[PDB]
Design a protein around this ligand. Structure first.
Ligand SMILES: O=C(O)Cc1ccc(O)c(Cl)c1
Ligand SMILES: O=C(O)Cc1ccc(O)c(Cl)c1
Ligand SMILES: O=C(O)Cc1ccc(O)c(Cl)c1
Ligand SMILES: O=C(O)Cc1ccc(O)c(Cl)c1
Ligand SMILES: O=C(O)Cc1ccc(O)c(Cl)c1
Ligand SMILES: O=C(O)Cc1ccc(O)c(Cl)c1
Ligand SMILES: O=C(O)Cc1ccc(O)c(Cl)c1
Ligand SMILES: O=C(O)Cc1ccc(O)c(Cl)c1
Lengths: 235, 239, 239, 235, 235, 239, 235, 239
């Protein structure tokens, strides 16, 4: 829902995991205690029996941002290392049950259904964050710039061996004014395109060395024009 | 050898989430479906209830928003798994980028796979976890603001000066219309209605005619502490 | 003595646009209507085709937008004229703030006034001109941007590199879809449609399937040179 | 229309004024010439017979902004001084006819209808700019702040003689966070409220000296709750 | 002193004006009271007998800034209207004596010396604020731009009738990068130069219509190269 | 007719501060000195103790800073007065821009003028007041910041939590070294020394080894509330 | 020198390495060619025989910045992986000689002196970049904040078991105003101090849990007060 | 086990650059010196020409700038090497933080070590390379600007419009004074002198009275393309 633009809370609760706490390790955390300490490597699924946990991510510049909140019957799915520094705080008296991989095998040997509850929990999280990323990058500025380039090359691109040449004086200023992107991003992107041998934007000529890549990165979409969309279902 | 994908100018293009070579050994228990270049592997109204394993080929996976905008989520190569075992809120369009062979694993067939090979459970868990880790980091990393949080911030401020603790709730005794909340925070009355509907539904806070009940002050507070991308605008752009 | 209104923190609150004491001498030629405090002098669906002269009292004049938002335009005291002789696009709500006497001058009665007193024409002109001067300055003074201008800017750039002069027009020979224009400028396909509909209607530019005709390059250019307040957002907020 | 958010052009053309050019002064302007020079005091209505004029406003900091464009049959209504420094440029060969007040009397003595055409032209301009100002100030930040104050006083305001007192520690930071307004505006506004004897925002007390004024400036609206709105028409 | 970059206080005290308070009007102001209200037109010199006054200026956007502080024996020199909205506040119990022009004539008829004390007070203020303006505009950005233009014209300016032409593609971006001035100022200035008929900066040509003015505005200085500086004193 | 000067792009170039036509009637009581185009009317080491009245011509008046930088203060035409009757801290260089006649009025000769014409006193007052009004507004109008004010701000903060009122002073009992003050505020130890020397001299505050005495808390506070142009840097640029 | 604030060029040339090119691999690069490609792992010292190389660093956000320029007799010291993505470009026809570790052993077996030339080259680079880092962080903003805290605790810190308490209402706003640091940095730092259990800054109390660490991180310096500085040399 | 140092809020505090355990086996060939807690291992005027190996203990290493400011460069624990074999431009103050044993290796003793163990050469190379990598990244990572680069930018612009190629140089024929260069770029005449002295010394460009010779256009250009921290100010703060 639209609620999830505002509140990241209560992902797919698994009440029934409550019945299997004897196969895990119960751990209690006071208000303000760290369930996951900054830099701690977690290798357990953490079931939230009773209480409230705030779960945040810590970036390499020291900044922290919220990922989500968890309450009764929530599951933190951090069975393996991820590459994200996470920290999590008990915001009230909190009882958890930690499930190691070994302990999970034991649960699923007794109850196969729990495999699929956990899958639903994971899927719910993927669906939510992937959707947010896509919404928030609908107007990604880099892609705006790349799409400009690709479009100019497709109409005005003159082939010259392996390359295409576009004969016009398109300034960086003009690029930023057309796309609506700040000058700093324009330069960065233009520097990337050149050092990677995709495209070099000179003062009165644009050269495209790797149209195929440029096209790739520009993220062309076409469902609505493509014949696939001529019926609701597959052929 | 290969990671998740190549980087261009600071962004990864994921084409290889946590592959599972070993599911090749269990394809006999699923359903093998072949797709020609350009073909739809998943159509946006299609109801998908199978994990889809990529034996050979390459798939482009996009989301389709209700306003008809389309956006790439990821590419999939050999040994990638599309984990769409249950309905999600999202309409997905995925196409074969080249001649492609897939194995579709219903829940029942996965049950069968796991009865033969328990380790496969954790391989699938690993795959899901890479995906959550990737997308959650992508969202958190964005420099974002959200004007609706001004509304939460107002409630938090009023709670901390005027709130009386009743059980595990705080009760604020005052009439504060939706219109007034909008006027103060500079957000449309209709958006304020929706914000307050969410707050109530998710048991954060309920704004009644003459009372505000706060069910989760700590959550309210920390949500209220937040804020390039207007997330409210982004959530609305697609109706 | 009094000007247009008092200032608070850098903003004038207009309560006294160019008064016309002398219209008091011509009220016999109009229609006198009295309003009690709180009463509606103008309702938002009402069709107004009279200039309304304020003999005694005070009026608050607001605009009502289609989404139901309301906003003050001005206050009127004694000797103020409300110049609403013809329909405008705007829905207006005006209320008496105190016991108020008005004289309503239809076109016919104004004809009569001007046959007796020619100078009154220029007094009314003076009043209108103060209003245009005030509001135009208010708009221009705002730090505004408008994302739709990126679309114009694209057309101008393409015209100046690829345009061939035909008569008083410039013809750009290229297919450029609305979808692509949106993608480049980072604005919704539906907004791009509306922008291009305006450009065509107002004889700036017409974007056809394989040709763009530019009817007014100079205007396009200078419009394209533009850009706190997103004017596109402001224009949409009220549906 | 929504077009007018993008294009300020062609306000209410008066074709028929073409028939009265002999009573005015015809003036021709080359491309790039100034029809109205920066700082020039204009006291004439300027009818645009043929061509195109760009009309701009110049601010006291040297900045210039567009007001509008004019073409055939447009009228520039600058019969009297306005307080705005305007400048206007012929963007192509342009023929105009300038009407002094004296000359206008002559026109209206021959044709009374022209009075009302000009009224429509003026009204069209007022309607347009007033509408733009209101749209663009729908979320005016100063008013946001004032509306906060007024609302807190109405619920939590304790009367103390002539004043109302509001006993709470509302920080400037908190004000800006709730309202969404930048700290610079918050201070400016708070300084204005205090020096004008309306309201003084101390650290743990807010005092309102002139509630009536504060209310005034806060721009309360109520059509939709007021009984006036219970029917489409007046009683 | 360097103190005055930090503290604008105690301008040239005139102790002896204390002896002439009977010829003026004594006025007492409580702590927090307004000695000069916002918008009040003052036509009196205000001698500060005892206490402390903070004196500020209010701009047309509602912003206020400090001009200075006054204490015992200070003089506020506001005998005539100035064009500045000033407001001044008693920061403690404060006794003042207000001198109208009539009252000042009476003082100077008794004591001619007081004329010259007041002159010194005025001169001290001029010396201080003029010095601050000059220090703070040592690197004025507009002048940077104008000096660029003037310098390019002096070396590369080719005369073409009344004009000079400079044949080069100097971008606005380049101007801002060389001068260190933000793009917004660059445009504003370039728009001013063009509408005033001084200089028009096209893409591949710069035309200077009024070199003399451009030179004027560029604020050329030359004491150290000029022969005037060849000796400490005049010839 | 003419004001103070012409405007370019938002800035006035003053060439005509409050002229005094009537001093023409009193030149017999001063000393008439003529200057050719390019000539120095005032040299930067010259000690000036006369008001200099401009009978005919035009003068360019600059300040010379100790590092040798030069900057225009104003131009003077006919009927302008240069009010440099006493030494100021400033080194002034003024040159004739054209053939120029001046009348130099010592204090004694002004005494004589005022014995004949009392009104001239107030004319000179008017002239001075225009100058103060102009330059003070110019300074206040600039968007300025000043890092040294961080030091004041620190003292104010410590005073308001730790200060004990003794008479009309506040005493803060704590050792706080100059080095530490610099480190906290991010300003050089040598600048901190100078800041604290000013504060003491001007009777704001005296920072002793183990005590801070604040002589004027209100002034300290409001000075501490302040902050394109770094005024500290500007004050130092000229040694 | 002060030149090195502006120009990072010509670090300690080793002319004599020219004599040992037969023990390395000569490689020639055209103008615009990549000597070190983005993402390339280099494990060789690269001697610059003839030409000019621009050497840059690429950050994880796609931004690139210059490290330095190299010319004849320069040495790029990238014998082992570093953790920095480097790319380097021949800005004219360029001849290099690449020395593997094996090849370097061969050089030093023939000429022991070359070991020490290379040491000087490395030392010159360390001396330069370390000096730049220190200059540029003289007023590090985080440290400003930490030094505030440490100083307040040292004077006003009241011991309470393991902790120190400082009883005052120091706002984040006040912290930023005193230190001169932007609000964003203030929060980030305050969040770091709290999650790391060093210090928690509440509204009316500051608690310091780990004074020793806070002190550590605050970077106290004392050469000039310490007795070590009482003589030029060691005891 | 341990890396280079602990991180606080995004910054590493280096306390352990590339340790060399194996130098413990060669201490007999150096000179063993012991230091008590608080003692100076390196004084700021001391001429250091030895690599200093840390056998046991801990050292704090600071730079002292000419204005007397002091700043930490790094800490050293066991197996750290201080690589100060030759004079650098920097004045270094290093103190024992605890009881500390060191071995000082002159050039001659290192020659001896390398005759016994060739591998030690590359260990020392590794240590130096970690240091360069760390500090260079720290500098590049900072958001910096440098006003002096405006001067380069001016020269580049003039070269690209007016420069005639002579051999491997470009000659610009024009008189452009240092004063004028300052005025244009908004930097002090004295700083401009120093900038131009550097450019000439390092064979970038030589600004003569009526000619500018550019020795390295490509370098000039890319240097000119540059620009929180004013590096010019930072370079000057310490005289
Ligand atoms: O640990 C991560 O990097 C991401 C994360 C956080 C919380 C969770 O419950 C999951 Cl499944 C993943
Ligand atoms: O279907 C979704 O909503 C999102 C999605 C897409 C692809 C995948 O492989 C997964 Cl696990 C989820
Ligand atoms: O009715 C309008 O649209 C705007 C308006 C309102 C009041 C007036 O007095 C005028 Cl001239 C126009
Ligand atoms: O001159 C003004 O200040 C405003 C203005 C400009 C143009 C016009 O056509 C009118 Cl009616 C008013
Ligand atoms: O009133 C002014 O505009 C400027 C001013 C203020 C205070 C004074 O004491 C003087 Cl002489 C002038
Ligand atoms: O001499 C000064 O310091 C400033 C100055 C210059 C010229 C004048 O006319 C005055 Cl009143 C002051
Ligand atoms: O490769 C690095 O990360 C740093 C570097 C670059 C160039 C060199 O010559 C050296 Cl010694 C180090
Ligand atoms: O001494 C210097 O200038 C810098 C320095 C300090 C310590 C070291 O270990 C090195 Cl290699 C260099």
């Amino acid at each position: 829902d639209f609620c999830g633009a505002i509140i990241p809370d209560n992902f797919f609760p698994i009440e029934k995991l409550r019945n299997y706490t004897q196969m895990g390790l119960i751990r209690d955390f006071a208000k303000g205690s760290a369930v996951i300490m900054p830099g701690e490597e977690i290798t357990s699924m953490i079931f939230l029996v009773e209480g409230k946990i705030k779960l945040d991510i810590i970036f390499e510049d020291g900044s922290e941002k919220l990922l989500y909140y968890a309450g009764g019957n929530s599951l933190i799915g951090k069975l393996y290392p991820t590459g994200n520094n996470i920290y999590a705080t008990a915001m009230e008296p909190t009882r958890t049950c930690w499930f190691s991989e070994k302990s999970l095998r034991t649960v699923f040997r007794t109850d196969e259904d729990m495999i699929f509850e956990i899958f639903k929990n994971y899927l719910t999280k993927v669906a939510y964050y992937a959707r947010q990323v896509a919404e928030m990058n609908t107007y990604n500025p880099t892609i705006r710039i790349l799409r400009l380039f690709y479009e100019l090359c497709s109409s005005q691109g003159k082939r010259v061996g392996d390359t295409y040449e576009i004969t016009m004086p398109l300034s960086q200023k003009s690029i930023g004014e057309i796309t609506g992107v700040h000058h700093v991003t324009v330069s960065r992107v233009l520097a990337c395109l050149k050092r990677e041998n995709i495209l070099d934007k000179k003062k009165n000529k644009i050269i495209v060395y790797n149209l195929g890549e440029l096209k790739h990165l520009s993220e062309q979409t076409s469902y609505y024009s493509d014949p696939n969309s001529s019926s609701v279902d597959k052929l």
